[PDB]
């Protein structure tokens, strides 16, 4: 039901398995219900999780989809994470 | 191969920009050449006269980011029982969304100055483009 | 209507959703299933305010338009060891200095 995603600085994020399987990368890392990210700090992985919720919510919704906000200070690191996770 | 049908059959259309972007409407003429039309500010609307069988797509006027119309990529005016064209943001991938933000913060010359994998350096300059998306 | 939350304690963060009409207690039931701790050993906070079990999340200011998917509201969590610990939420890591080219 829920999986655990651990950031590089010890923060533990707990999200639904369905939400986590958005990333094919994470699906592979689960197959063992915890994934350790040595390269992804808290301020990035938290945004990744918010995107999971965002993506599941607005995929095939037909409602006015809002912009997914990314602070300029986060963009650089979030891009690297997104690239790696194929998110 | 992807052109508007010259039907000469009038079709009233309402462009409804339901996105926080400045929308650039693009009409594909009878040769397939992308023909830009006046831009729509966010949350605004505009009534235009088009024709049945004409091909429309929509982009961010400033960055050419892809947008959706009626939950798809292509809008084709049909028989008027005004046809409504709902223009919305798609759910971009996290990677592409991050690219959009980085592109809007860094001038294209300084893409090389950023400390990232060379793969990302290429992805950054591979800007969204009308002709690029125009194939199938 | 659905509200989207981050239930946080120390270095733990749970992303989940709930109805506006659902109660604080029912949210503790969610936490129980995930962290294996009974509601009586749990305290839920909005910022610094202790939340009452009987109140709905909407009454506690968790509305569907402020607890959004892309920006979830934060609910504080505090466990009981038989006294209750203080509410403690570790901040996330700090972003690097904004690059000169940005
Ligand atoms: C002002 N209306 C137009 O420009 C219409 C819209 C599009 O169908 C193309 N077109 C033509 C060729 O008249």
UniProtKB/Swiss-Prot annotation, chain A:
Major site of localization recorded for this protein: nucleus
Example of a GO MF term: transcription corepressor binding
Domain of life: Eukaryota
UniProt keyword terms in alphabetical order: Host-virus interaction, Nucleus, Transcription, Transcription regulation, Ubl conjugation, Ubl conjugation pathway
Gene Ontology CC: Cul2-RING ubiquitin ligase complex; Cul5-RING ubiquitin ligase complex; cytosol; elongin complex; nucleoplasm
Biochemical pathway: Protein modification; protein ubiquitination
Disulfide bond positions: none
Organs and tissues of expression: Overexpressed in prostate cancer cell line PC-3 and breast cancer cell line SK-BR-3.
GO process annotations (BP): protein ubiquitination; regulation of transcription by RNA polymerase II; target-directed miRNA degradation; transcription initiation at RNA polymerase II promoter; ubiquitin-dependent protein catabolic process
Pfam families in the record: Skp1_POZ
SMART domains referenced in this protein's UniProt entry, alphabetically: Skp1
Cell compartment(s), UniProt: Nucleus
SUPFAM superfamilies reported in the protein's UniProt record: POZ domain
Function summary: SIII, also known as elongin, is a general transcription elongation factor that increases the RNA polymerase II transcription elongation past template-encoded arresting sites. Subunit A is transcriptionally active and its transcription activity is strongly enhanced by binding to the dimeric complex of the SIII regulatory subunits B and C (elongin BC complex).
Name of this protein: Elongin-C
Organism field: Homo sapiens
Species lineage: Eukaryota, Metazoa, Chordata, Craniata, Vertebrata
From Swiss-Prot, chain B:
One GO CC term on file: nucleus
UniProt effect for mutating residue 100 to R: In VHLD; type II
One BP annotation, GO: negative regulation of autophagy
Effect of residue 19 to I: In VHLD; type I
Residue ranges of the region described as Interaction with Elongin BC complex: 93-102
Outcome (variant: residue 53 to R): In VHLD; type I-II
Substitution effect: residue 120 to R: In VHLD; type I
Mutation effect (residue 98 to W): In VHLD; type I-II
UniProt effect for mutating residue 46 to P: In VHLD; type I
Quaternary assembly: Component of the VCB (VHL-Elongin BC-CUL2) complex; this complex acts as a ubiquitin-ligase E3 and directs proteasome-dependent degradation of targeted proteins. Interacts with CUL2; this interaction is dependent on the integrity of the trimeric VCB complex. Interacts (via the beta domain) with HIF1A (via the NTAD domain); this interaction mediates degradation of HIF1A in normoxia and, in hypoxia, prevents ubiquitination and degradation of HIF1A by mediating hypoxia-induced translocation to the nucleus, a process which requires a hypoxia-dependent regulatory signal.
Name by which UniProt lists this protein: von Hippel-Lindau disease tumor suppressor
Swiss-Prot record, chain C:
Gene3D superfamilies attached to this UniProt entry: Phosphatidylinositol 3-kinase Catalytic Subunit, Chain A, domain 1
PROSITE patterns the UniProt entry points to: UBIQUITIN_2 (PS50053)
A Gene Ontology term for the protein's cellular component: VCB complex
Sites of Phosphothreonine modification: 83
A Pfam family reported for this protein in Swiss-Prot or TrEMBL: ubiquitin
Compartment(s): Nucleus
Molecular-function GO term, any one: ubiquitin protein ligase binding
Superkingdom of origin: Eukaryota
Claim: Kinase is one of the keywords in the record: no
Protein name, UniProt field: Elongin-B
Organism encoding this protein: Homo sapiens (Human)
Phylogenetic lineage: Eukaryota, Metazoa, Chordata, Craniata, Vertebrata
Gene (UniProt): ELOB
């Amino acid at each position: 039901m829920y999986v655990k995603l651990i950031s590089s600085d010890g923060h533990e994020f707990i999200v639904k398995r369905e939400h986590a399987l958005t990333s094919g990368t994470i699906k592979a890392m689960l197959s063992t219900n915890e994934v350790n990210f040595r390269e992804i700090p808290s301020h990035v992985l938290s945004k990744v999780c918010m995107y999971f919720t965002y993506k599941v919510r607005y995929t095939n919704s037909s409602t006015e989809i809002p912009e997914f906000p990314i602070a300029p200070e986060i963009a650089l690191e979030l891009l690297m994470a997104a690239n790696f996770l194929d998110c | 191969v992807l052109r508007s049908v010259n039907s000469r059959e009038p079709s009233q259309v309402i462009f409804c920009n339901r996105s926080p972007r400045v929308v650039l409407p693009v009409w594909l003429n009878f040769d397939g050449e992308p023909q830009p039309y006046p831009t729509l500010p966010p949350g605004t609307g505009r009534r235009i006269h088009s024709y049945r069988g004409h091909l429309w797509l929509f982009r961010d006027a400033g960055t050419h980011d892809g947008l959706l119309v009626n939950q798809t990529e292509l809008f084709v005016p049909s028989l008027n029982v005004p046809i409504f064209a709902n223009i919305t943001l798609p759910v971009y991938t996290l990677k592409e969304r991050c690219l959009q933000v980085v592109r809007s913060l860094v001038k294209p010359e300084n893409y090389r100055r950023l400390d990232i994998v060379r793969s990302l350096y290429e992805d950054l300059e591979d800007h969204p483009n009308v002709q690029k998306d125009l194939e199938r | 209507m659905d509200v989207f939350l981050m239930i946080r304690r120390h270095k733990t963060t749970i992303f989940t959703d709930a109805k506006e009409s659902s109660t604080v207690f029912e949210l503790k039931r969610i936490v129980e299933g995930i962290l294996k701790r009974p509601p009586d050993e749990q305290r839920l906070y909005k910022d610094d305010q202790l939340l009452d079990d009987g109140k709905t999340l909407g009454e506690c200011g968790f509305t569907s338009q402020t607890a959004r998917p892309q920006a979830p509201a934060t609910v504080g969590l505090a466990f009981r060891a038989d006294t209750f610990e203080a509410l403690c939420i570790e901040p996330f890591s700090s972003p690097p200095e904004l690059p000169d080219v940005m």
